[PDB]
A paper describes a structure:
Later, CX-4945 was revealed to have a strong inhibitory activity on CLKs; IC50 values of 82.3 nM (CLK1), 3.8 nM (CLK2), and 90.0 nM (CLK3). In order to elucidate the selective inhibitory effect of CX-4945 on CLKs, we determined the structures of CLK1, CLK2, and CLK3 in complex with CX-4945.
Out of CLKs, CLK2 was most strongly inhibited by CX-4945 with 3.8 nM of IC50 in vitro, which is quite noteworthy in that most of CLK inhibitors are more potent on CLK1/CLK4 than CLK2. CLK2 had the longest N-terminus with an extra eight residues; in contrast, CLK1 had the shortest N-terminus. For the β-hairpin insertion structure, CLK2 had a complete conformation, whereas CLK1 showed a partially disordered loop. Intriguingly, the charge distribution pattern of CLK2 was the weakest compared with that of CLK1 and CLK3, indicating its preference to bind to the hydrophobic benzonaphthyridine ring of CX-4945. Therefore, based on the size and electrostatic charge distribution of the active site, the binding of CLK2 to CX-4945 could be stronger than the binding of the other two CLKs. Third, out of three CLKs, CLK2 has the weakest charge distribution, favoring its hydrophobic interactions with benzonaphthyridine ring.
Numbering used by the authors: 144 to 485
Write the structure that this text describes.
């Protein structure tokens, strides 16, 4: 009973393994569909079931992800470290099905269903903290969630409040609680298993990955630095799909790539005479210089708390992966002082 592209054919009210009962669809992706379900063997707890196509490569992909979720569950027995919880998984007629705790909209969907209006800085703070907290729990267990984006950070609950802005004559949404979870472990890699060559989503991709210099945990921090910027202004920091433009935007926003990285990268067609081969006086050259600025010029306030957020973002968008801030040292960063510890 299969779709023309491999998906399960279901309707509201269908049952799965006479155990789950479909209520709604939450979304879809290339891999399959996520459905809201009631789980009558967990006393009617509401779950989110992921239904992946009959396609083998996805079936095998999910088996790897199921292993990562198994390990997360093994090393967070009290569900304190803010990665999504898998309650169950089963093979259903060639469809791999994973049972997750029910959460809300992503931090991206909310940001766009609010017209790409940034989150207020004190929300950026609790979101950034939880992000680092959860990705540090992975690093402390020899993992790299290879694919961090606002799409994969779910609000536990994205109920909000509407308020009218007298000042700016605008209807503003404000999510009530900022508890998040990190999701989508389909790409996470233990330290000891095989590493893909290219990982992450172009906009959140670290330069070491681009220059094929070898990657591990530090490349997540790069991602996190990009998501934080987006949380704070609404738009992605790097808006490209080409390597040389990408590498050129980084040089615009962060200054020149260090020579240690250049001389060592085998991607030498991007450089001439030790420097990035890029002519600012061209077609794409002045598209880059016009469409993004040095980092701290994106500051919307000289308040010291705002300078502390860009102090943070600057340390995660460091070129050299080992000069790059670690999540351990990030939970200790001055920017997170105003938070209440627990
Ligand atoms: O991959 C996971 O680990 C993963 C795990 C859980 C959820 C999820 C993705 N996506 C949700 N939303 C969503 C939104 C848009 C498209 C798609 Cl496919 C899904 C969702 C909602 C409520 N509860 C859990 C989830």
């Amino acid at each position: 009973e299969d779709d023309a592209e491999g998906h399960l054919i279901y309707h509201v009210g269908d049952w799965l393994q006479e155990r789950y009962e479909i209520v709604s669809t939450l979304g879809e992706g290339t891999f399959g569909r996520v459905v809201q379900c009631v789980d009558h063997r967990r006393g009617g707890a509401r779950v989110a079931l992921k239904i992946i196509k009959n396609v083998e490569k996805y079936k095998e992909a999910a088996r790897l992800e199921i292993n990562v979720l198994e390990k997360i569950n093994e090393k967070d027995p009290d569900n304190k470290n803010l990665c999504v919880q898998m309650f169950d998984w089963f093979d259903y007629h060639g469809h791999m099905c994973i049972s997750f705790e029910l959460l809300g909209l992503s931090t991206f969907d909310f940001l766009k269903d609010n017209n790409y209006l940034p989150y207020p800085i004190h929300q950026v703070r609790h979101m950034a903290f939880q992000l680092c907290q959860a990705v540090k729990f992975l690093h402390d267990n020899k993992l790299t969630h290879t694919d961090l984006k606002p799409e994969n950070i779910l609000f536990v609950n994205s109920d909000y409040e509407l308020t009218y802005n007298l000042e700016k004559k605008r209807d503003e949404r404000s999510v009530k609680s900022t508890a998040v979870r990190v999701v989508d472990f389909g790409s996470a890699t233990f330290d000891h298993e095989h590493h893909s060559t290219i990982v992450s989503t172009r906009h959140y991709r670290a330069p070491e990955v681009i220059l094929e210099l070898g990657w591990s945990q530090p490349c997540d921090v790069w991602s996190i630095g990009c998501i934080i910027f987006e949380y704070y202004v609404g738009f992605t920091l790097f808006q490209t799909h080409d390597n040389r433009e990408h590498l050129a935007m980084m040089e615009r926003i962060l200054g020149p790539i260090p020579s240690r990285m250049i001389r060592k990268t085998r991607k030498q067609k991007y450089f001439y005479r030790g420097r990035l081969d890029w002519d600012e006086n061209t077609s794409a050259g002045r598209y880059v210089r016009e469409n993004c600025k040095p980092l701290r010029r994106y500051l919307t306030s000289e308040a010291e708390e705002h300078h502390q957020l860009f102090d943070l973002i600057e340390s995660m968008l460091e070129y050299e992966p080992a000069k790059r801030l670690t999540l351990g040292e990030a939970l200790q960063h001055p920017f997170f002082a105003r938070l209440r510890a627990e």
